RNA sequence: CUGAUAACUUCACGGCGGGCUUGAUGUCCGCGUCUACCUGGUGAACUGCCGAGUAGGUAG
């Protein structure tokens, strides 16, 4: 249990988001911000980033790609734990299939969870996916405030079973891969503000990249992947989802759920995996503390990270 | 040939700008009787923070002062020891003649400011020419703004909420018999008066 | 209640002359640093007029 070496590599890996501004003359230009340098009499930046006057809409773009790196550890000291883990993932996909996790990630891509506080004060936003490998025209999700609200409402779309099935083949098939390109249109009001990411300094300086000479804000690479992994709704007496860490950390209200006293963190669950291959070789599985722990373990191997001593 | 006094703020538990601003609010409460525009506000301390522990209003000829200092505001306030209106002392002539102007460029640096400015700029395209696309008036992408202090007041009959700004130039003592516009600063620009320390 | 008490060592003074360390010299062969990662503006500096004016003056 917990050798010197154990490490997994991540399955989902997204990229930076890029913001552009569309004009009524039918073009698009990058979005720029400004600092103001606060001087004394005879230093800290303050950055502001607002939508320019007379525009039409904001277009955001990024690209996410799902892979199969969860089926075998990147490192392992002992040929005793790897056998357990590969048949753990094999019994999980035999008994209780990949559709819950796949739908629960694709919902967070399709509604704009990665538009962190940018859809407050917004009229309509429209998300378009371009998947790969694929044959057909693009997969559109239109006006997510008043047309897409729940899991039953997404399933009444034309192109949903194919998207969740290619995510299932990516998580299942060894040497398998799916790639989605995402771009989303935001119709913000006149002179609405924009909230990108902020650099770590110990005020309010933005994260930026250069797009063809103009600097632009991005809203993160690691931030935008912490919004596709807000799926943790299985902790004891649950009410509200979480980023899938190992110690159930809710960010703003400082405290951590899933403390190791409760035994519902990753290590207390992981060290009882011979019980999970015990129960999943039977003929009935309870959905209250056995399915809700296999979901947490499989969502926490997809994240990756080194499980050492 | 006239004089200053210090309304001192001493409760030793107070924020200074938010008392000084409503002192200037009740200064604007005065001078609706008719436009007797003869008052300077004259904040005698000015650090790189903290608008001073004092305020020092000026009058002209010793009696208009106590029409201003009975401004329906300290009469129900000064039962106890919180402020101190200083008692009408002819000026010691060892001070410095400094300025107080509302500069209207702290207020028009914001993105709302050039939004208003560009929407005015073809509000009055009525000298009819070829209309521009507004896709090129990109803002000042790096700006070094100097020191300023802000006072939080509001509009005189409407619910419009601006602020007002103060700087501390030093300039040219002798000029005229010192009228201004309404509430107390020296951005009149017909007679831009220094009112001393 | 001190092997007790007391106890001005000092003046002068030229170490100099001379001196070729050199000859020769292959350090090289091999080499995977890798896995994981939300810094946040609670709401928050408005609405106008003149200026041919991203510059400049105003009223509240």
Topology record:
This is part of a larger assembly, with chains A (309 residues) and B (197 residues).
Chain A lengths: L5 E3 L9 E5 L5 E3 L3 E5 L6 E4 L8 E11 L7 E2 L4 H15 L3 H12 L14 E8 L6 E3 L9 H4 L6 H12 L4 E10 L21 E4 L2 E4 L12 E3 L9 E2 L22 H5 L2 H7 L11 H11 L3 E2 L3
Antiparallel strand pairs in A: 1-7, 1-15, 2-3, 2-6, 4-5, 6-10, 8-9, 8-10, 11-12, 13-14
Chain B lengths: L6 E3 L7 H13 L24 E2 L9 H4 L14 E2 L26 H11 L22 E2 L3 E3 L12 E3 L31
Antiparallel strand pairs in B: 1-2, 1-3, 5-6
Chain B binds one RNA strand of 60 nucleotides through helix 3.
Detailed description of the structure:
The structure is cut from a larger assembly and holds chains A (309 residues) and B (197 residues). With 309 residues, chain A is of the alpha+beta class. Chain A has helices at residues 81-95, 99-110, 151-154, 161-172, 266-270, 273-279, 291-301, and strands at 6-8, 18-22, 28-30, 34-38, 45-48, 57-67, 75-76, 125-132, 139-141, 177-186, 208-211, 214-217, 230-232, 242-243, 305-306. Chain A is 21% helix and 22% strand. In chain A, the strands form five sheets. In chain A, strands 3-2-6-10-8-9 form a six-stranded antiparallel sheet, covered by helices on one side. In chain A, β11 and β12 (214-217) form a beta hairpin. In chain A, α1 (81-95) packs parallel to α6 (273-279) and α2 packs across α4 (161-172). Chain A is globular and about 70 Å long. The relative contact order of chain A is 0.20. Chain B has a three-stranded antiparallel sheet, with no helix packed on it. In chain B, strands 5-6 form a two-stranded antiparallel sheet. Chain B is elongated and about 65 Å long. Chain A binds chain B through residues 23, 25, 29, 32-41, 48, 50, 52-54, 190-191, 215, and chain B through 46-48, 109-112, 114-115, 118-119, 133-135, 137-147. The structure holds one RNA strand of 60 nucleotides. It is classed as immune system. Keywords: Type I-F CRISPR-Cas system, Tn7-like transposons, RNA-guided tranposition, immune system. CryoEM structure of Cascade-TniQ complex. Chain A: CRISPR-associated protein Cas7.
């Amino acid at each position: 249990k917990l050798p010197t070496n154990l490490a997994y590599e991540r399955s989902i890996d997204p990229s930076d988001v890029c913001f552009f501004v569309v004009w009524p003359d039918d073009r698009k230009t990058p979005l720029t911000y400004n600092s103001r340098t606060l001087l004394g009499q005879m230093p800290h930046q303050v950055d502001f980033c607002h939508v320019p006057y007379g525009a039409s809409h904001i277009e955001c773009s990024f690209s996410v790609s799902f892979s199969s790196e969860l089926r075998q550890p990147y490192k392992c000291n002992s040929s005793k734990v790897k056998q357990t883990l590969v048949q753990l993932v094999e019994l999980y996909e035999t008994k209780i299939g990949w559709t819950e996790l796949a739908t629960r990630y694709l919902m967070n891509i399709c509604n704009g969870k990665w538009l962190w506080k940018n859809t407050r004060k917004a009229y309509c936003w429209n998300i378009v996916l371009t998947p790969w490998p694929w044959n057909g025209e693009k997969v559109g999700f239109e006006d997510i405030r008043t047309n897409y609200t729940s899991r039953q409402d997404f399933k009444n779309n034309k192109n949903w079973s194919a998207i969740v099935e290619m995510i299932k083949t990516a998580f299942s098939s060894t040497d398998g891969l799916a790639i989605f390109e995402v771009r989303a249109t935001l119709h913000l009001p006149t002179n609405a503000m924009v909230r990108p990411s902020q650099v770590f300094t110990e005020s309010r300086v933005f994260q930026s990249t250069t797009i063809d000479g103009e600097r632009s804000p991005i809203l993160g690479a690691f931030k935008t992947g912490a919004a596709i992994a807000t799926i943790d709704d299985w902790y004891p007496e649950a009410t509200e989802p979480l980023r899938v860490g190992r110690f159930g950390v809710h960010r703003e209200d400082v405290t951590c759920y899933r403390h190791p006293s409760t035994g519902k963190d990753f290590f207390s669950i992981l060290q009882q995996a011979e019980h999970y291959i015990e129960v999943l070789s039977a003929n009935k599985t309870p959905a209250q503390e056995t399915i809700n722990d296999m979901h947490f373990l499989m969502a926490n191997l997809i994240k990756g990270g080194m499980f050492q001593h | 040939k006239w004089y200053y006094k210090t309304i001192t703020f001493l409760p030793e538990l107070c924020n200074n700008e938010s008392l000084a601003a409503k002192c200037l609010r009740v200064l604007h409460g005065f001078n609706y009787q008719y436009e007797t525009r003869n008052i300077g506000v004259s904040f005698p301390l000015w650090c790189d923070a903290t608008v001073g522990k004092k305020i020092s209003f000026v009058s002209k000829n010793k009696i208009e002062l106590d029409l201003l200092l009975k401004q329906h505001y300290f009469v129900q306030m000064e039962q106890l020891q919180y402020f101190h209106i200083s008692n009408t002392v002819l000026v010691p002539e060892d001070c410095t003649y400094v300025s107080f102007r509302r500069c209207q460029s702290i207020d028009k640096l914001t993105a709302a400011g050039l939004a208003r400015k560009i929407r005015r700029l073809e509000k009055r395209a009525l000298s009819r020419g070829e209309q521009f696309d507004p896709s090129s008036f990109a803002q000042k992408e790096h700006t070094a703004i100097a020191h300023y202090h802000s006072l939080g007041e509001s509009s005189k009959q409407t619910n419009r909420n601006f602020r007002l700004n103060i700087r501390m130039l030093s300039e040219q003592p002798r000029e005229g018999n010192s009228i201004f516009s309404s509430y107390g600063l020296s951005n009149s620009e017909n007679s831009f008066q220094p009112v001393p320390l």
